[PDB]
């Protein structure tokens, strides 16, 4: 009850900033996550014994893949923490609880392969879940871990609060399916401009939480350049392995996944910043003005990729 988590001075300060990096010390990531729950939610939201046991079971069910790993999980959870702390009063007690857990869990048991590769491989998961294949699996893995003995961090919620929080988490994880980002943002764009956006409209809130999840999930592009650039290597390490596996299936991968077309990466980053990242953080800032630092940081990194192409690095 009286057992707070504290961090060294530099982390205590830097963790409040959108562009915070959680560092290379794996054994501090759980403390960082608990620290963020205690300040975001209260020291009372979860039983510490249960939370800690949930955290370690979630860590166990992330795999040793280059990018979609335990570090990504905690990175995406921190970006959600930053958004929630900068938007203190827009979010219910349940939503703050559900979303940090949703982020920690959003990529559970990822193998480093796109929904596309699952379908072309004819993976059993593609039979069981036709759309948002990996994202339905991640939610399913979250519900499994929540049903382990001693792992129900939600136990003190009423039957109906409990169904609301599992429903917040399900939508939050499904929304990290980038194929659903485009329509989700176009709708949010129309609603904010025509002026119809209404945060008491649950179907509207859902879309806004959906965009937050895309924003947190993509937060690699909102770090300081050296973090962004070094994360790019891990993302491409997965992309190129998937390409190698596509060629094993007798399918020329798209250039993004073809390690022969490394040359074309800087241009590909540009596309993605222009087509996905900038529009995403633009719409997020329009709805949640205090999330502007994510837009600025993303713009700075777009400018860093333009420099790469021009031979200035
Ligand atoms: C991790 C991923 C699931 C979602 N994600 N999180 C952060 C970032 Cl960054 C991304 C992402 O998607 N990065 C992209 C997106 C589109 N691309 C296209 C090319 C490319 C390259 C060479 C030739 C041609 C094209 N490269 C791309 N890289
Ligand atoms: Mg994912
Ligand atoms: Zn992710």
Swiss-Prot record:
Q: What mutagenesis or variant effect is reported for residue 107 to N?
A: Reduces activity 1000-fold
The effect of residue 107 to A is:
Loss of activity and of zinc binding
Residues that, per the record, bind 3',5'-cyclic GMP: 68, 269
The source's domain of life comes to: Eukaryota
Q: What are the binding positions for a divalent metal cation 1 in this chain? A: 72, 106-107, 217
The active site lies at 68
| Binding residues annotated for 3',5'-cyclic AMP, in chain numbering | 68, 269
Q: Print the domain comment field.
A: The tandem GAF domains bind cAMP, and regulate enzyme activity. The binding of cAMP stimulates enzyme activity. Composed of a C-terminal catalytic domain containing two divalent metal sites and an N-terminal regulatory domain which contains one cyclic nucleotide-binding region.
Disease annotation reads:
Dyskinesia, limb and orofacial, infantile-onset: An autosomal recessive, early-onset hyperkinetic movement disorder characterized by axial hypotonia, dyskinesia of the limbs and trunk, orofacial dyskinesia, drooling, and dysarthria. The severity of the hyperkinesis is variable.
Protein name (Swiss-Prot/TrEMBL): cAMP and cAMP-inhibited cGMP 3',5'-cyclic phosphodiesterase 10A
Organism encoding this protein: Homo sapiens
Span within the full-length protein is: 724 to 1036 of 1055
């Amino acid at each position: 009850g009286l057992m707070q988590f504290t961090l060294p001075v530099r982390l205590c300060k830097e963790i409040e900033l959108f562009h915070f990096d959680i560092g290379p010390f794996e054994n501090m990531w759980p403390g960082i996550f608990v620290y963020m729950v205690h300040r975001s939610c209260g020291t009372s939201c979860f039983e510490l014994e249960k939370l800690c046991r949930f955290i370690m079971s979630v860590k166990k069910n992330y795999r040793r893949v280059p990018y979609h790993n335990w570090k990504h999980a905690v990175t995406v959870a921190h970006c959600m923490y930053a958004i929630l702390q900068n938007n203190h009063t827009l979010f219910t007690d349940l939503e703050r609880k559900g979303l940090l857990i949703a982020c920690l869990c959003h990529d559970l048991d990822h193998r480093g392969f796109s929904n596309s590769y699952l379908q072309k491989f004819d993976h059993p998961l593609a039979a069981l879940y036709s759309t948002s294949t990996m994202e339905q699996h991640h939610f399913s893995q979250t519900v499994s871990i929540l049903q382990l003995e001693g792992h129900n961090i939600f136990s003190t919620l009423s039957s109906s609060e409990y169904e609301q929080v599992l429903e917040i988490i399900r939508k939050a994880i499904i929304a990290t399916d980038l194929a659903l980002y485009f329509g989700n943002r176009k709708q949010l764009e129309e609603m904010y401009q025509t002026g119809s956006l209404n945060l008491n409209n649950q179907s509207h809130r859902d879309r806004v939480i959906g965009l937050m999840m895309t924003a947190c999930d993509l937060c690699s592009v909102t770090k300081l350049w050296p973090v962004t650039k070094l994360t790019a290597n891990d993302i491409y390490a997965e992309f190129w392995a998937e390409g190698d596996e596509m060629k094993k299936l007798g399918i020329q991968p798209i250039p993004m996944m073809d390690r022969d077309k490394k040359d074309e990466v800087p241009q590909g980053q540009l596309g993605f910043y222009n087509a996905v990242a900038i529009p995403c953080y633009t719409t997020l800032t329009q709805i949640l003005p205090p999330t502007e630092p994510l837009l600025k940081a993303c713009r700075d990194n777009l400018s860093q990729w333009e420099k790469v192409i021009r031979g200035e690095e």
